Amino acid sequence: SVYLQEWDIPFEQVELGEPIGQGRWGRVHRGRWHGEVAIRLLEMDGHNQDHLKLFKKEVMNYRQTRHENVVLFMGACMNPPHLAIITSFCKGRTLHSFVRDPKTSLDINKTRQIAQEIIKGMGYLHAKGIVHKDLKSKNVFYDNGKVVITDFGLFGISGVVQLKLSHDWLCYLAPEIVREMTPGKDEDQLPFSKAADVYAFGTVWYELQARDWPLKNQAAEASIWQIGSGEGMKRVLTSVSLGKEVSEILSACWAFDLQERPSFSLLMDMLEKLP
Amino acid sequence: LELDEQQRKRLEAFLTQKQKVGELKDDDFEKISELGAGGVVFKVSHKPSGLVMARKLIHLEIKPAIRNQIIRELQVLHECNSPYIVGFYGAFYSDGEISICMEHMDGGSLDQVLKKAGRIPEQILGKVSIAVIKGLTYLREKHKIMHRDVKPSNILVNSRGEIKLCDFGVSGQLIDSMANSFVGTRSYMSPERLQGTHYSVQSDIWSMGLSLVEMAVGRYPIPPPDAKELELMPMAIFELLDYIVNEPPPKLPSAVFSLEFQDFVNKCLIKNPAERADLKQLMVHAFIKRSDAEEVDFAGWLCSTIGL
Ligand SMILES: CNS(=O)(=O)Nc1cccc(-n2c(=O)n(C3CC3)c(=O)c3c(Nc4ccc(I)cc4F)n(C)c(=O)c(C)c32)c1
Ligand SMILES: Nc1ncnc2c1ncn2[C@@H]1O[C@H](COP(=O)(O)OP(=O)(O)NP(=O)(O)O)[C@@H](O)[C@H]1O
Ligand SMILES: Nc1ncnc2c1ncn2[C@@H]1O[C@H](COP(=O)(O)OP(=O)(O)NP(=O)(O)O)[C@@H](O)[C@H]1O
Ligand SMILES: [Mg+2]
């Protein structure tokens, strides 16, 4: 049990507002801290089966964080089995709905600056030993220049919620994870790592170029083999050329051998030596 | 086609009963029992009209504007009617889920039949093949549609002895609009389809072949049993899928089954779809010719092995 009086942020009141989406990690509400916040509501079947112990650890880990490109983690109150995670509210559009808007005009400069911001945020997280499981274009927000990353480290939690997969998610999943995928296995068991995150950045980098995800919607099984074999990403890399400098980092991030994938500090330099 | 006259008879007797309802709503139906989990299908009673239907439940939370596109594509299904196609009663939207009420086939799926019987004999499996082949030809020749999801759980039987296909791919918008598909432990998808390349009805032909081997031997045949395991008679999904793409396809044992049956499935499971038999070639295979001319009271076998 951890309460709101243990937190950096001074707490007096918090009013729920309208929800803005449900997922397998609870429900997200537009809230009001005199500032709007995002409140994620969870339930933990883990009746003190180290879940809370881990939760206290991971939540305290989220504490001591602040960066202009990462969401401001504010609070996490737990009145078991009911938990809640309060985050700063990002105004503006998701990068997903932003890049797929026809009227939007992105170039190699706008694209470069956007990627840099994401790496700066993701670099902070890796420096703190915080693996951002679940990085994707739906969890990145853009508002007239400001870029923020969302919902980091959430998959490390073991709260209650045939395999259950989306398509938009598979394009970000690295092969090492897809091979280990099997029914009755939980998210905690998959091999997320600093390397697993940079793979998902490649699918983001591709979305910044192609304005879509790499694999046209298929039966997830097809996406499994195409990803787990590495052949699928090899085909789409060949199927359309973009630029040696651009394709360099896409082939780099999507390297099949995880150790052949660069660190985020390395990616900062690669994004500099660009058009 | 090569439609018989009696086939016209039994279709028409259903389509008179068709007009026996006009509209559908949630409260018309009473849950009788649960069939299985996948969508989930329930036995239901219709109350405005004495027809007993099968109601399958697909949970979706999506906006009204897309639904009218799905429904207008879906309206074409009222036009297709065949002794090899489960009859359809209607489609509607209600409380965050599409309910599909359809013809009840009293024998269930081939998966649940196989579990109870242990093994399915060669001669029954011959009669099943003819019904499937003619259904796919109809869809190709009259509507230009492939099934895309043929497998035992979607093959239904009844006590009259009819065999009908369900869960086929009528709506292009619904495929695209379905963001989230669900995978399990058995896959019946063809190799070419699994690699994300160009595909046709040929991928359905693989699924039929592979489905037949499972039912003939009583076990999902990937991976093959070992030498000592076939006498007596914990794997990740990608290992199974990579087996399909790279290892030789399963085959029937060579002792206990006829060459026509062994050769037929072998021709269905050729990995290169250009060499895999097509419907025209399948229609003329010796195995099919024998089964088509054989006199087997299929209804009697079904009732007697399942204990009515
Ligand atoms: C998963 N691999 S995939 O990515 O390639 N997508 C895909 C591929 C192949 C089939 C389907 N599919 C489907 O699986 N089911 C079953 C719910 C589990 C459908 O019911 C289905 C469908 N309903 C339907 C129509 C007539 C009858 I009689 C009974 C029915 F249930 N209709 C209209 C479809 O058009 C498709 C395309 C369906 C999905
Ligand atoms: N801090 C936030 N500010 C604004 N919107 C947010 C925030 N966190 C989450 N959301 C949105 O709330 C909705 C539900 O969140 P989430 O639980 O992550 O589901 P999801 O993002 O749609 N994908 P998934 O995690 O698989 O459920 C999504 O539309 C998110 O974009
Ligand atoms: N119309 C039906 N009538 C009776 N039993 C059915 C019917 N459809 C499916 N079943 C059974 O209930 C289970 C659930 O089927 P369903 O939800 O339609 O998906 P599935 O048949 O398992 N394969 P799929 O439909 O492609 O996802 C199947 O495994 C069958 O055993
Ligand atoms: Mg998220």
XYZ file of C-alpha atoms and ligand atoms in Angstrom:
685
model
C 0.000 0.000 0.000
C 1.324 3.384 -1.151
C -0.750 6.554 -0.923
C -0.779 10.010 -2.486
C 0.988 11.691 0.439
C 4.304 9.990 -0.429
C 4.705 11.721 -3.783
C 6.806 14.597 -5.091
C 3.681 16.380 -6.372
C 1.640 18.132 -3.648
C -1.755 16.427 -3.537
C -5.005 18.052 -2.421
C -7.769 16.886 -4.780
C -8.385 15.008 -8.030
C -11.657 14.854 -9.989
C -12.352 12.263 -12.667
C -13.652 13.441 -16.018
C -14.671 11.702 -19.222
C -12.846 8.491 -20.160
C -10.974 8.583 -23.454
C -10.316 4.930 -24.204
C -10.117 1.399 -22.825
C -7.367 -1.157 -23.284
C -5.974 -4.312 -21.753
C -4.250 -2.010 -19.214
C -7.361 -0.512 -17.630
C -9.264 2.632 -18.531
C -7.855 6.109 -19.206
C -9.824 9.158 -18.031
C -9.401 12.823 -18.816
C -8.921 14.102 -15.315
C -8.285 17.297 -13.348
C -5.474 17.533 -10.812
C -5.412 23.084 -11.525
C -4.235 21.099 -14.520
C -5.673 18.247 -16.558
C -4.212 14.774 -16.019
C -4.611 11.266 -17.409
C -5.773 8.648 -14.899
C -5.325 4.950 -15.675
C -7.516 2.668 -13.556
C -6.330 -0.872 -12.845
C -7.286 -3.943 -10.832
C -4.691 -6.357 -9.440
C -5.696 -9.983 -8.941
C -2.180 -10.523 -7.593
C -3.258 -10.876 -3.960
C 0.100 -9.746 -2.565
C 1.950 -12.243 -4.755
C 4.995 -9.974 -5.086
C 2.908 -8.029 -7.624
C 2.505 -5.090 -5.246
C 6.117 -5.448 -4.085
C 7.175 -5.255 -7.736
C 4.569 -2.543 -8.334
C 5.952 -0.470 -5.455
C 9.428 -1.020 -6.906
C 8.503 -0.151 -10.490
C 6.326 2.805 -9.492
C 9.096 4.194 -7.281
C 11.321 3.644 -10.314
C 9.008 5.826 -12.392
C 9.439 8.426 -9.649
C 12.641 10.544 -9.894
C 11.995 11.020 -13.625
C 11.592 14.239 -15.571
C 12.331 15.015 -19.204
C 10.847 17.343 -21.799
C 10.186 14.485 -24.251
C 8.698 11.990 -21.737
C 5.307 12.229 -19.973
C 5.520 13.662 -16.455
C 4.833 10.733 -14.146
C 2.870 12.282 -11.273
C 1.344 9.713 -8.938
C 0.321 6.129 -8.364
C -2.180 5.438 -5.600
C -3.131 1.877 -4.689
C -6.188 0.975 -2.648
C -5.962 -2.733 -3.400
C -7.149 -4.416 -5.469
C -8.010 -1.118 -7.183
C -5.025 0.869 -8.441
C -4.651 4.106 -10.376
C -1.796 5.771 -12.258
C -1.970 9.542 -12.730
C 0.055 11.058 -15.569
C 0.311 14.525 -17.045
C -2.207 15.076 -19.835
C -0.794 15.587 -23.324
C -2.832 17.950 -25.455
C -2.787 17.605 -29.207
C -2.883 14.642 -31.532
C -1.208 11.257 -31.334
C 1.630 10.771 -33.794
C -0.472 7.947 -35.276
C -3.421 10.160 -36.227
C -1.028 13.032 -37.030
C 1.177 11.327 -39.640
C -1.888 9.802 -41.338
C -3.622 13.158 -41.786
C -3.560 14.175 -45.483
C -3.068 17.896 -44.785
C 0.130 17.274 -42.781
C 3.411 18.185 -44.518
C 6.451 16.374 -43.081
C 9.958 16.683 -44.560
C 13.443 15.315 -43.835
C 13.984 18.204 -41.414
C 10.659 17.916 -39.578
C 11.167 14.127 -39.591
C 14.726 14.447 -38.264
C 13.786 16.807 -35.433
C 10.877 14.561 -34.410
C 13.095 11.466 -34.251
C 15.763 13.336 -32.262
C 13.208 14.342 -29.615
C 12.024 10.732 -29.278
C 15.595 9.454 -28.895
C 16.359 12.112 -26.269
C 13.387 10.899 -24.244
C 14.142 7.217 -24.830
C 17.783 7.899 -23.960
C 16.830 9.266 -20.544
C 14.753 6.140 -19.879
C 17.586 3.776 -20.839
C 20.076 5.772 -18.750
C 17.757 5.191 -15.773
C 17.637 1.476 -16.592
C 13.934 1.847 -17.423
C 12.984 -0.374 -20.359
C 10.042 1.220 -22.193
C 8.034 -1.848 -23.027
C 5.226 -1.067 -25.498
C 6.676 1.736 -27.649
C 4.498 2.564 -30.664
C 3.093 5.481 -32.655
C -0.163 5.405 -30.680
C 1.844 6.181 -27.510
C 3.572 9.336 -28.827
C 1.936 12.780 -28.798
C 2.608 15.841 -30.972
C 1.400 19.393 -30.263
C 2.687 22.181 -32.572
C 6.312 21.153 -32.040
C 6.223 19.491 -28.626
C 6.746 15.709 -28.698
C 6.013 13.433 -25.724
C 6.327 9.670 -25.076
C 3.555 7.862 -23.188
C 2.774 4.681 -21.226
C 6.342 3.528 -20.602
C 7.221 0.460 -18.523
C 3.555 -0.474 -18.199
C 4.053 -4.080 -19.364
C 6.236 -4.887 -16.339
C 3.065 -5.002 -14.208
C 1.153 -8.250 -13.700
C -2.405 -7.065 -13.152
C -5.556 -8.823 -14.266
C -7.077 -8.230 -17.690
C -6.248 -18.105 -27.836
C -3.704 -15.320 -28.246
C -4.865 -11.692 -28.269
C -2.944 -9.560 -30.765
C -3.568 -6.385 -32.766
C -1.961 -5.583 -36.094
C -0.673 -2.111 -35.219
C 1.203 -3.701 -32.296
C 2.920 -6.507 -34.242
C 4.743 -4.111 -36.567
C 6.629 -2.836 -33.484
C 7.394 -6.253 -31.951
C 10.947 -7.483 -32.474
C 11.551 -11.068 -33.693
C 13.059 -12.279 -30.393
C 9.688 -11.617 -28.769
C 7.510 -13.133 -31.501
C 9.423 -16.425 -31.439
C 8.984 -16.721 -27.666
C 5.256 -15.983 -27.981
C 3.001 -18.845 -26.909
C -0.469 -19.210 -25.353
C -0.825 -19.089 -21.579
C 2.349 -16.984 -21.400
C 2.129 -13.494 -19.891
C 3.690 -10.228 -21.046
C 6.204 -10.242 -18.179
C 7.927 -13.276 -19.727
C 8.695 -11.713 -23.098
C 12.276 -10.499 -23.674
C 11.778 -6.755 -23.766
C 15.114 -4.977 -23.504
C 16.840 -1.769 -24.488
C 17.319 -3.495 -27.858
C 13.645 -4.515 -28.122
C 12.695 -0.824 -27.834
C 14.966 0.359 -30.677
C 13.339 -2.182 -33.006
C 9.941 -0.591 -32.348
C 11.601 2.754 -33.109
C 12.327 1.389 -36.580
C 8.639 0.783 -37.233
C 8.130 4.368 -36.045
C 10.864 5.574 -38.405
C 9.145 3.679 -41.218
C 5.795 5.280 -40.362
C 7.503 8.677 -40.539
C 8.534 7.808 -44.122
C 5.760 5.610 -45.547
C 2.838 7.222 -43.640
C 1.669 3.676 -42.802
C 2.909 0.593 -40.983
C 5.263 -1.857 -42.740
C 2.900 -4.805 -43.140
C -0.390 -4.199 -44.922
C -3.060 -5.752 -42.715
C -2.773 -9.549 -42.787
C -3.735 -12.499 -40.651
C -1.556 -12.125 -37.558
C -0.050 -15.557 -38.272
C 1.369 -14.186 -41.528
C 2.812 -11.206 -39.647
C 4.294 -13.664 -37.121
C 6.377 -15.623 -39.626
C 7.282 -12.532 -41.657
C 8.596 -10.905 -38.469
C 9.949 -13.955 -36.638
C 11.834 -15.060 -39.745
C 13.130 -11.547 -40.372
C 12.285 -12.047 -44.055
C 9.259 -9.756 -43.889
C 11.272 -6.717 -42.834
C 13.899 -7.645 -45.439
C 11.291 -7.589 -48.218
C 9.693 -4.269 -47.248
C 13.191 -2.790 -46.929
C 13.912 -3.825 -50.535
C 10.350 -3.311 -51.814
C 10.786 0.482 -51.772
C 13.953 2.562 -51.655
C 14.049 5.838 -49.770
C 17.682 6.878 -49.373
C 20.927 5.238 -48.299
C 21.116 7.491 -45.238
C 17.438 6.885 -44.423
C 17.530 3.150 -45.197
C 20.802 2.883 -43.240
C 19.127 3.523 -39.889
C 16.018 1.502 -40.770
C 18.167 -1.530 -41.584
C 20.115 -0.685 -38.417
C 17.195 -0.505 -35.976
C 15.505 -3.595 -37.455
C 18.684 -5.701 -37.294
C 17.692 -9.320 -36.747
C 20.560 -10.012 -34.341
C 19.601 -7.795 -31.407
C 23.249 -7.082 -30.582
C 23.598 -5.606 -34.085
C 21.029 -2.941 -33.125
C 22.462 0.442 -32.104
C 22.032 2.160 -28.774
C 19.955 5.323 -28.587
C 23.053 7.458 -27.995
C 24.398 6.072 -31.276
C 21.097 6.950 -32.970
C 21.498 10.599 -31.956
C 24.649 10.832 -34.083
C 23.097 8.940 -37.004
C 20.233 11.450 -37.061
C 22.717 14.344 -37.169
C 24.637 13.157 -40.241
C 21.478 13.431 -42.368
C 19.946 15.785 -44.990
C -22.682 -27.085 -60.189
C -24.225 -30.266 -61.598
C -27.222 -29.633 -59.362
C -29.420 -32.604 -58.578
C -33.206 -32.292 -58.438
C -33.487 -33.331 -54.772
C -30.869 -30.741 -53.833
C -33.292 -28.169 -55.263
C -36.009 -29.791 -53.113
C -34.257 -29.461 -49.753
C -32.964 -25.943 -50.470
C -36.479 -24.777 -51.444
C -38.101 -26.271 -48.339
C -35.738 -24.110 -46.266
C -36.327 -20.970 -48.377
C -40.092 -21.184 -47.895
C -39.386 -21.186 -44.143
C -37.071 -18.217 -44.868
C -39.917 -15.699 -45.212
C -41.288 -16.937 -41.841
C -39.456 -13.991 -40.230
C -38.864 -10.401 -41.280
C -36.958 -8.593 -38.510
C -34.500 -9.543 -35.766
C -33.738 -8.164 -32.302
C -31.796 -9.254 -29.221
C -34.854 -10.108 -27.099
C -36.236 -12.585 -29.660
C -33.656 -15.174 -28.549
C -33.272 -17.370 -25.458
C -29.870 -18.923 -24.704
C -30.180 -22.727 -24.667
C -26.539 -23.727 -24.143
C -22.940 -22.793 -24.909
C -21.269 -24.536 -27.852
C -17.636 -23.416 -27.808
C -15.163 -20.578 -27.408
C -13.115 -19.105 -30.241
C -16.213 -15.733 -31.398
C -18.617 -17.813 -29.303
C -21.729 -19.542 -30.662
C -24.858 -20.265 -28.617
C -27.920 -22.384 -29.307
C -30.887 -20.012 -29.288
C -34.666 -20.169 -29.680
C -36.361 -17.613 -31.898
C -39.705 -16.539 -30.465
C -41.449 -14.419 -33.166
C -41.108 -17.541 -35.342
C -40.676 -21.218 -34.482
C -37.308 -21.473 -36.260
C -34.411 -22.648 -34.073
C -31.164 -20.900 -35.003
C -27.471 -20.843 -34.091
C -26.370 -17.450 -32.730
C -22.625 -16.702 -32.900
C -21.463 -13.648 -30.904
C -18.672 -11.326 -32.121
C -17.811 -8.540 -29.639
C -16.964 -5.200 -31.296
C -16.946 -1.566 -30.060
C -16.814 0.586 -33.228
C -18.536 3.694 -34.619
C -21.946 3.677 -36.410
C -20.676 5.038 -39.758
C -18.552 1.981 -40.609
C -21.343 -0.483 -39.673
C -23.591 0.500 -42.589
C -20.736 -0.359 -44.974
C -20.281 -3.784 -43.349
C -24.017 -4.512 -43.516
C -24.421 -3.613 -47.196
C -21.537 -5.911 -48.156
C -23.061 -8.517 -45.815
C -26.478 -8.312 -47.516
C -25.063 -10.261 -50.492
C -25.003 -13.361 -48.257
C -28.802 -13.614 -48.415
C -28.348 -14.339 -52.126
C -26.014 -17.327 -51.858
C -27.863 -20.522 -50.948
C -26.523 -24.040 -51.420
C -26.798 -27.496 -49.832
C -23.064 -27.011 -49.197
C -23.504 -23.591 -47.512
C -25.117 -23.101 -44.093
C -28.341 -21.158 -44.477
C -28.314 -17.569 -43.249
C -31.166 -15.771 -41.463
C -29.964 -12.212 -40.895
C -27.458 -9.812 -39.420
C -27.931 -6.892 -37.041
C -26.142 -4.633 -34.565
C -26.920 -4.548 -30.850
C -25.185 -3.421 -27.627
C -21.580 -3.503 -28.814
C -21.656 -6.820 -30.705
C -22.912 -8.294 -33.975
C -25.056 -11.394 -33.470
C -25.241 -13.814 -36.403
C -28.186 -16.220 -36.276
C -27.858 -19.119 -38.709
C -29.002 -22.639 -39.542
C -28.484 -25.093 -36.694
C -26.557 -28.176 -37.807
C -27.229 -30.816 -35.145
C -23.941 -32.668 -35.500
C -21.635 -29.803 -34.485
C -18.083 -29.429 -35.729
C -15.699 -32.088 -37.025
C -13.340 -31.292 -34.125
C -15.878 -32.363 -31.502
C -16.940 -35.391 -33.564
C -13.325 -36.562 -33.960
C -12.655 -36.190 -30.212
C -15.601 -38.484 -29.448
C -14.891 -41.070 -32.165
C -11.103 -41.229 -31.886
C -10.569 -41.614 -35.619
C -12.692 -40.849 -38.682
C -12.715 -43.660 -41.278
C -11.515 -43.171 -44.839
C -14.926 -43.730 -46.435
C -16.689 -40.983 -44.470
C -13.872 -38.533 -45.257
C -14.440 -39.227 -48.951
C -18.049 -38.038 -48.767
C -16.946 -34.866 -46.940
C -14.460 -33.999 -49.711
C -17.111 -34.023 -52.470
C -19.322 -31.572 -50.575
C -16.379 -29.222 -49.930
C -15.126 -29.318 -53.545
C -18.542 -28.405 -54.950
C -18.983 -25.569 -52.458
C -15.685 -23.946 -53.457
C -16.458 -24.315 -57.177
C -19.804 -22.559 -56.675
C -18.121 -19.658 -54.878
C -15.421 -19.371 -57.549
C -17.724 -19.643 -60.558
C -20.729 -17.639 -59.365
C -19.325 -15.086 -56.882
C -15.502 -15.079 -57.365
C -14.899 -15.528 -53.610
C -12.437 -17.706 -51.720
C -13.287 -18.974 -48.235
C -9.955 -18.051 -46.510
C -10.661 -19.864 -43.203
C -11.544 -23.523 -43.862
C -10.994 -25.782 -40.842
C -12.835 -28.537 -38.902
C -14.418 -26.197 -36.339
C -16.271 -24.434 -39.193
C -17.546 -27.616 -40.892
C -21.010 -28.519 -39.605
C -23.065 -31.713 -39.894
C -26.694 -32.719 -39.359
C -28.701 -35.909 -38.922
C -30.080 -35.800 -42.476
C -26.475 -36.067 -43.646
C -25.927 -32.645 -45.226
C -22.564 -30.865 -45.020
C -22.353 -27.076 -45.173
C -19.591 -24.442 -45.034
C -19.661 -21.394 -42.745
C -17.472 -18.422 -41.664
C -16.308 -17.551 -45.207
C -14.941 -14.163 -46.341
C -17.842 -12.125 -47.752
C -16.834 -8.573 -46.675
C -13.659 -6.847 -47.845
C -14.407 -3.881 -45.590
C -14.865 -6.140 -42.545
C -11.433 -7.737 -43.017
C -9.810 -4.294 -43.159
C -12.028 -2.927 -40.391
C -11.190 -5.865 -38.095
C -8.056 -4.428 -36.507
C -7.538 -7.237 -33.987
C -7.416 -10.885 -35.020
C -6.897 -13.754 -32.583
C -4.517 -16.698 -32.998
C -4.542 -19.961 -31.052
C -2.529 -23.163 -31.063
C -3.514 -24.897 -34.322
C -3.062 -23.133 -37.669
C -4.559 -24.343 -40.957
C -3.163 -21.507 -43.097
C -1.197 -22.440 -46.214
C 2.551 -21.710 -46.526
C 2.149 -19.114 -49.302
C -0.407 -17.244 -47.189
C 1.873 -17.355 -44.130
C 4.677 -15.600 -46.034
C 2.468 -12.647 -46.948
C 2.697 -13.237 -50.696
C 0.097 -13.342 -53.458
C -2.642 -15.879 -52.756
C -5.771 -17.364 -54.305
C -8.258 -20.176 -53.597
C -5.213 -22.490 -53.605
C -4.570 -21.600 -49.963
C -8.036 -22.955 -49.150
C -7.100 -26.208 -50.919
C -4.150 -26.656 -48.554
C -6.440 -26.081 -45.570
C -8.779 -28.831 -46.769
C -5.917 -31.286 -47.240
C -4.387 -30.561 -43.837
C -7.808 -30.709 -42.158
C -8.395 -34.171 -43.653
C -5.127 -35.587 -42.275
C -5.964 -34.383 -38.748
C -9.408 -36.003 -38.853
C -8.102 -39.210 -40.452
C -5.463 -39.795 -37.763
C -7.181 -38.244 -34.730
C -4.412 -35.739 -33.951
C -3.314 -32.393 -35.314
C -0.505 -33.781 -37.480
C 2.162 -31.093 -36.954
C 4.601 -32.069 -35.706
C 4.411 -35.635 -37.105
C 4.396 -38.399 -34.494
C 7.539 -40.484 -34.216
C 7.867 -44.092 -35.394
C 6.988 -45.626 -32.024
C 4.210 -43.066 -31.434
C 2.332 -43.922 -34.649
C 2.138 -47.566 -33.544
C 0.443 -46.607 -30.264
C -2.018 -44.417 -32.203
C 4.635 -27.237 -25.410
C 5.569 -25.606 -28.736
C 5.507 -21.909 -29.573
C 3.340 -20.822 -32.498
C 6.269 -19.626 -34.632
C 8.008 -23.012 -34.405
C 4.839 -24.595 -35.788
C 4.530 -21.956 -38.519
C 8.195 -22.351 -39.491
C 7.605 -26.106 -39.746
C 4.837 -25.485 -42.294
C 7.037 -23.200 -44.398
C 10.284 -25.187 -44.326
C 9.645 -28.811 -43.427
C 7.989 -31.385 -45.690
C 4.184 -31.461 -45.416
C 2.481 -34.182 -43.353
C 1.432 -37.348 -45.168
C -0.838 -40.298 -44.475
C 0.676 -43.617 -43.357
C 1.256 -45.929 -46.293
C 0.057 -49.202 -44.727
C -3.564 -48.664 -43.755
C -4.956 -46.323 -46.435
C -5.627 -46.535 -50.161
C -3.390 -44.836 -52.718
C -6.302 -42.744 -53.970
C -6.771 -41.320 -50.475
C -3.026 -40.885 -49.887
C -2.395 -39.382 -53.329
C -5.394 -37.044 -53.053
C -4.248 -35.346 -49.836
C -0.663 -35.289 -51.146
C -1.871 -33.360 -54.206
C -3.742 -30.972 -51.894
C -0.687 -30.248 -49.709
C 1.896 -29.490 -52.402
C 3.544 -26.349 -51.060
C 3.984 -24.707 -54.473
C 0.387 -23.612 -55.242
C 1.005 -23.737 -59.008
C 1.588 -27.494 -58.730
C -1.070 -28.039 -56.072
C -4.228 -29.446 -57.618
C -6.997 -27.005 -58.478
C -10.730 -27.644 -58.261
C -10.860 -28.786 -61.889
C -8.108 -31.345 -61.244
C -9.566 -32.338 -57.856
C -13.026 -32.993 -59.331
C -11.533 -35.800 -61.461
C -9.200 -37.488 -58.951
C -9.706 -41.235 -58.492
C -10.366 -40.862 -54.753
C -13.251 -38.477 -55.430
C -14.681 -40.609 -58.242
C -14.792 -43.643 -55.938
C -16.437 -41.779 -53.046
C -18.996 -40.091 -55.310
C -20.268 -43.465 -56.575
C -20.200 -45.150 -53.140
C -23.396 -45.864 -51.201
C -22.743 -44.911 -47.564
C -25.604 -44.109 -45.181
C -23.744 -41.243 -43.525
C -26.662 -40.276 -41.267
C -26.718 -43.776 -39.782
C -22.992 -43.777 -39.034
C -23.226 -40.363 -37.362
C -26.208 -41.238 -35.165
C -24.708 -44.604 -34.160
C -21.202 -43.394 -33.287
C -22.341 -40.280 -31.380
C -25.167 -42.158 -29.635
C -27.950 -40.148 -31.280
C -8.018 -14.442 -39.478
N -7.301 -14.215 -40.739
S -7.545 -12.762 -41.634
O -6.660 -11.683 -41.193
O -7.113 -12.930 -43.027
N -9.197 -12.278 -41.528
C -10.209 -13.298 -41.823
C -9.846 -14.316 -42.710
C -10.750 -15.324 -43.040
C -12.021 -15.302 -42.466
C -12.393 -14.287 -41.571
N -13.661 -14.383 -41.099
C -13.804 -15.151 -40.001
O -12.841 -15.636 -39.498
N -15.020 -15.364 -39.461
C -15.124 -16.185 -38.236
C -15.428 -15.203 -37.092
C -14.456 -16.353 -36.865
C -16.118 -14.827 -40.005
O -17.189 -15.015 -39.526
C -16.027 -14.019 -41.184
C -17.240 -13.475 -41.734
N -18.538 -13.760 -41.064
C -19.462 -14.837 -41.519
C -20.031 -14.762 -42.791
C -20.899 -15.739 -43.248
C -21.228 -16.809 -42.434
I -22.562 -18.263 -43.180
C -20.678 -16.903 -41.157
C -19.797 -15.918 -40.696
F -19.267 -16.030 -39.441
N -17.165 -12.708 -42.842
C -18.366 -12.109 -43.447
C -15.987 -12.450 -43.445
O -15.971 -11.769 -44.425
C -14.770 -12.962 -42.953
C -13.538 -12.545 -43.784
C -14.784 -13.802 -41.744
C -11.486 -13.267 -41.234
N -1.346 10.586 -20.979
C -2.267 10.464 -21.938
N -2.744 11.588 -22.521
C -3.667 11.472 -23.480
N -4.220 10.365 -23.982
C -3.729 9.270 -23.389
C -2.775 9.229 -22.383
N -2.511 7.920 -22.012
C -3.295 7.210 -22.787
N -4.057 7.961 -23.643
C -5.022 7.470 -24.622
O -5.996 6.705 -23.943
C -6.446 5.621 -24.788
C -6.333 4.312 -24.045
O -4.965 4.119 -23.636
P -4.268 2.699 -23.694
O -4.631 1.948 -22.471
O -2.757 2.830 -23.907
O -4.858 1.985 -24.984
P -4.208 2.209 -26.382
O -3.213 3.320 -26.285
O -5.333 2.591 -27.389
N -3.434 0.814 -26.904
P -3.422 -0.346 -25.673
O -2.383 -0.002 -24.652
O -3.102 -1.764 -26.285
O -4.850 -0.377 -24.997
C -5.644 5.720 -26.087
O -6.402 6.362 -27.107
C -4.421 6.545 -25.678
O -3.897 7.294 -26.769
N -22.753 -22.699 -36.243
C -22.273 -23.492 -35.284
N -23.095 -24.417 -34.736
C -22.617 -25.215 -33.777
N -21.394 -25.240 -33.241
C -20.603 -24.317 -33.801
C -20.951 -23.424 -34.802
N -19.875 -22.615 -35.134
C -18.917 -23.029 -34.340
N -19.285 -24.058 -33.512
C -18.462 -24.731 -32.507
O -18.082 -23.787 -31.528
C -16.691 -23.433 -31.673
C -16.575 -21.939 -31.861
O -16.657 -21.635 -33.274
P -16.454 -20.167 -33.829
O -16.614 -19.133 -32.712
O -17.340 -19.955 -35.002
O -14.935 -20.143 -34.267
P -14.256 -21.483 -34.678
O -15.314 -22.432 -35.314
O -13.653 -22.124 -33.471
N -13.062 -21.164 -35.804
P -13.315 -19.614 -36.424
O -14.873 -19.405 -36.603
O -12.638 -19.466 -37.751
O -12.747 -18.551 -35.406
C -16.128 -24.267 -32.825
O -14.865 -24.819 -32.469
C -17.176 -25.368 -33.038
O -16.857 -26.551 -32.314
Mg -0.567 3.148 -24.602
